Design a binder for these strands. Structure first.
Length: 160
DNA sequence: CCTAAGCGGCAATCC
DNA sequence: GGGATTGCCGCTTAG
């Protein structure tokens, strides 16, 4: 839905700048959370009827060691511009403001992260993201960088 | 009245 | 019983 494509030249100009704030967010291989929300309990109502997590539903659970650092966007909404040229809204939420998610749709961040893993042939549908998934991809961290716009961050996840 | 999931927080764990 | 951290689950609210 609310996704925008940014031209490779506007991306070059944007990513050329230096960042006041920057964080290296681990791509965790936890099995019922983070990248692998798909393999956790679904959403169950009071009558016990459950609803499977979508494949692209993800979160980046960010440790306090990082969210407590100077400049981190705690409980803010903000624009994210990816290194491969996509723009969408993300939101930090939950206790310690640990949950890094795309806003209004959890799948958007998932389509970005997983769709990237899929394209490079490191991940196929309904598969767990493991150390070897990330090792084959060539990256196990997300770069969250600031721009001179307080509400726009750069998000990177380059592979091999 | 609903249903569905965005996102807030529960709870398992380790001190 | 308490706090501190964060996987993980499902409450609550907007549609």
């Amino acid at each position: 839905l609310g996704v925008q494509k940014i031209a490779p030249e506007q991306i070059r100009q944007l990513f050329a700048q230096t960042s006041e704030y920057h964080f290296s967010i681990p791509a965790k291989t936890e099995e019922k959370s983070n990248l692998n929300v798909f393999f956790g309990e679904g959403r169950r109502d009071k009558r016990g009827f459950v609803k499977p997590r979508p494949w692209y539903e993800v979160e980046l659970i960010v440790s306090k060691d990082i969210t407590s650092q100077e400049g981190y966007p705690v409980l803010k909404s903000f624009t994210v511009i990816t290194d491969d040229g996509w723009q969408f809204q993300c939101k930090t939420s939950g206790d310690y403001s640990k949950n890094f998610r795309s806003e209004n749709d959890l799948k958007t961040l998932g389509k970005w992260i997983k769709g990237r893993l899929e394209s490079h042939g490191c991940l196929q549908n309904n598969e767990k993201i493991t150390h070897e998934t990330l090792r084959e991809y060539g990256n196990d961290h997300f770069e969250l960088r600031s721009t001179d716009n307080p509400d726009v961050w750069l998000l990177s996840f380059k592979g091999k």
